[PDB]
Amino acid sequence: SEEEIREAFRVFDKDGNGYISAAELRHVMTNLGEKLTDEEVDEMIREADIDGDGQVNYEEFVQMMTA
């Protein structure tokens, strides 16, 4: 299945565009599930968002390994 990651990312998208605003993603990442570190968050959103706009694409992160 591909819903192993993608279907779990939608559950955060409140825009339905395909890209969430880093700020929101950061607050949920170190809140829901387990507890990571500010380091493991910022760096995670850094390796993904290369543009710097703020709207990071989640499927671009999911289909990354496939790329």
Binding site: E4, I5, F9, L32, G33, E47, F61, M64, M65
Partner: peptide
């Protein structure tokens, strides 16, 4: 840049463990 695949893996198992954990406790 250094380990994007590693980061990808992080969320991979993160969502996986959470999805099945939510139905466990």
């Amino acid at each position: 840049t250094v380990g994007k695949f590693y980061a990808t893996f992080l969320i991979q198992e993160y969502f996986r463990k959470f999805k099945k954990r939510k139905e466990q406790g």
